[PDB]
Amino acid sequence: RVNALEQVVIPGIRAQIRFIQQVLEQREREDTFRLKRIKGKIEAREAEEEGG
């Protein structure tokens, strides 16, 4: 059990959280980028009242 644990199990049960984490995290680049372009629209709209 000792032998086994220090190899396949333990860091493996780690790398699972890590892999998960990183992909959850990276997904939220697209969130911000989209949200950016959303902002751009909103301001662009109130900038046609006062200009072009």
């Binding site: 997904r27 697209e30 989209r34 959303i38």
Partner: protein, 457 residues
């Protein structure tokens, strides 16, 4: 012919001098490649509009652009006689002869079917795979997606359901062989092998004079991967309901669907909201699946069989997500029985079923597999699960009792789940099933009744 571009990139165009266009309208256009393409007015605007071309732009100059409102609503000519003929996503016949004359020109958007107009079906069919016709019971007007991984076959298994699809003559207490049985097809993205592979098993089927094929290739535009689905199903509505025939519709490559869905997802205005895919996705998989259902007053039916091909074996992936919820009763394929050489490689241990004592297993559907389904479940489980538990507890450790559990695993799976070119009737199933069930003594066989046991001794 309206001229004046503002944005062109992909099958989404924007062009001005418009307000005479309606939601869901056939226009035409001119391009610099000297060709006249299509366009559905998917969205409408103040002095422009969003157009969706039925072909990829590979050339379109700003000197020469055009718009001509052909028709206000958007439609396809559909007639009674079009069986025996092949078609494509554009909607031209690929046969080589003049296009048939409509009776109705029905919209391609689809008109939903009333939930009031249906009623519980109960007439079962032979799929030529034992496992289905016992556990889930595939009846008319019911969906049952066959979940398929990526790196897994999808084509192989599909073919088995197409050449061994057949009503019971009176094994259920009746037939529907008295009315013509026919099949409809429509592929949404296919390569070089999948093209011919399907056609040569339809000559096995003996059906190519009574089927309507809406083949969409990958050399065919990517925009017609989501047009064609709706389109196909309107030619289902026409022939099952209004010309009383039991039509089997079989939809495959609902991952190539999802490729095209994604495109409009982010390239249009709308933002992602289903973990990096659209949020109007729901409607896109609703309008598709919810049309199908046996209507009460009609003899005929649209029986839809979705065949997925979803990326890997994730279950958080958009596709299996919504599909799960939608369908009532499901079937899965895995890689447990695809390393053993067992075609089909159906695995019901993680799979689920929600109709098997819900208007099925009772009624004009036999009660002699009623208690069998309930029994097979917890029995098959005892199996598979402990195959895992053995490699922890010991390396060969299994007690008097658990020994029996695992004994019924290897056996059931081999015999039963290898069908393929072998057809088993309702009777042939139950016989064999009970004889593997005699491996467990009385007390695990509590669920089967006194009658059942002797019945199929």
């Amino acid at each position: 012919e309206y001229t004046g571009i503002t944005y062109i990139s992909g099958p989404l165009l924007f062009v001005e001098n418009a307000k005479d266009l309606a939601y869901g309208a056939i226009v035409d256009i001119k391009d610099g490649t000297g060709r006249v393409r299509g366009g559905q007015v998917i969205e409408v605007s103040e002095e422009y509009a969003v157009i969706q071309v039925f072909e990829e732009t590979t050339g379109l100059d700003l000197a020469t652009t055009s718009v001509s409102l052909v028709e206000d609503v958007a439609r396809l000519g559909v007639s009674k006689e079009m069986l025996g003929r092949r078609f494509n996503g554009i909607g031209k016949p690929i046969d080589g002869l003049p296009p048939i004359t409509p009776e109705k020109r029905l919209p391609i958007t689809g008109l939903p079917l009333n939930p009031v107009a249906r009623r519980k079906p109960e007439q079962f069919i032979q799929t030529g795979i034992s496992t289905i016709d016992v556990m889930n019971t595939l009846v008319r007007g019911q969906k049952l997606p066959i979940f398929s991984g990526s790196g897994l076959p999808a084509n192989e298994i599909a073919a088995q359901i197409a050449r061994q699809a057949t009503v019971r003559p009176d094994l259920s207490g009746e037939g529907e062989k008295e009315e013509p049985f026919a099949v409809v097809f429509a592929a949404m993205g296919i390569t070089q092998r999948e093209l011919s592979y399907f056609i040569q098993e339809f000559e096995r089927t003996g059906a190519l004079s009574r089927s309507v094929l809406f083949l969409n290739k990958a050399d065919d535009p990517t925009i017609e991967r989501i047009l064609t689905p709706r389109m196909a199903l309107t030619v289902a509505e026409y022939l099952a309901f209004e010309h009383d025939y039991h039509v089997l519709v079989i939809l495959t490559d609902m991952t190539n669907y999802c490729e095209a869905l994604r495109e409009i997802g982010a390239a249009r205005e709308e933002i992602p909201g289903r973990r990096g895919y659209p949020g109007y996705m729901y409607t896109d998989l609703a309008t598709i699946y919810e049309r199908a259902g046996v209507v009460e007053g009609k003899k005929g039916s649209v029986t839809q069989i979705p065949i997925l091909s979803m990326p890997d074996d994730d279950r958080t992936h958009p596709i299996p997500d919504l599909t799960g919820y939608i369908t009532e009763g499901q079937i899965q394929l895995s890689r447990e029985l695809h390393r053993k050489g067992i075609y089909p490689p159906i695995d019901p241990l993680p799979s689920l079923s929600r109709l098997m004592n819900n208007g099925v297993g009772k009624g004009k559907t036999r009660e002699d597999h009623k208690q069998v389904s309930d029994q097979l479940y917890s029995a098959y489980a005892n199996g598979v699960d402990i195959r895992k538990l053995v490699a922890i507890i010991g390396e060969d450790a299994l007690t008097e009792n658990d020994r029996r559990y695992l004994q019924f695993a290897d056996a059931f799976e081999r015999f039963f789940i290898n069908q393929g070119q072998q057809n088993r009737s309702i009777e042939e199933s139950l016989q064999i099933a009970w004889a593997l069930l005699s491996m467990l003594p009385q007390g695990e066989l509590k669920r089967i009744s006194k009658d059942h046991i002797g019945k199929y001794y």
